[PDB]
Amino acid sequence: GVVDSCCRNSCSFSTLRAYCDS
Amino acid sequence: NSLRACGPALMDMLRVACPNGFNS
Numbered sequence: 001g002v003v004d005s006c007c008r009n010s011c012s013f014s015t016l017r018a019y020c021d022s
Numbered sequence: 023n024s025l026r027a028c029g030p031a032l033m034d035m036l037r038v039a040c041p042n043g044f045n046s
Contacts, residue, residue, distance in 0.1 A: 010025060020040030
């Protein structure tokens with residue numbers, strides 16, 4: 001999830017955004 | 023072109039990046 005993608009690794013802003021609810 | 027955030031900062035960033043929120 002978001003922690004794996006953006007904390008354990010760096011992520012792009014569009015990747016952060018994809019982890020939002022919609 | 024990258025971001026890295028852990029703990030409260032990551033939650034604060036999701037809060038402003040996400041209009042309809044997030045729930046993991």
